[PDB]
């Protein structure tokens, strides 16, 4: 149960890298919307950033947190350097997907999947 770390020795240092990544993403959103001429608001973009961060709030492993920060930093570099195109940035919002049913009855009417 002894493992080689990536960047952080414990959750305390992992959380520091998470916050720094969030600050960079939070401050980058206004530039992204303007540079890519997006048709969403800065509030919408920053809400998505929170949504993406919050879905991983349950991780207690500093190695998994380290990889999530590494991938999040990669995703930010692509955006800041404009390697992404408008299509890549806008994929986070799924605006051509019809909302899939959630409750049992709605799912029961359409098909067999859970």
């Amino acid at each position: 149960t002894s493992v080689k770390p990536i960047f952080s020795r414990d959750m305390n240092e992992a959380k520091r890298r998470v916050r720094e990544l969030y600050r960079a993403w939070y401050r980058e959103v206004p530039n992204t919307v303007h540079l890519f001429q997006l048709d969403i608001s800065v509030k919408q973009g920053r809400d998505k950033v929170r949504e993406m961060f919050k879905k991983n709030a349950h991780i207690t492993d500093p190695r998994v947190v380290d990889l999530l920060v590494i991938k999040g930093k990669m995703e930010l570099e692509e955006t800041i350097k404009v390697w992404k195109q408008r299509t890549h940035v806008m994929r986070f919002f799924h605006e051509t997907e019809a909302p899939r049913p959630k409750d049992f009855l709605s799912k029961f009417y359409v098909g067999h999947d859970p």
Binding site: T1, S2, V3, K4, R9, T60, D61, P62, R63
Partner: peptide, 8 residues
């Protein structure tokens, strides 16, 4: 090394 006691 570091100690990780979490489920993988």
């Amino acid at each position: 090394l570091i100690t990780v006691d979490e489920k993988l």
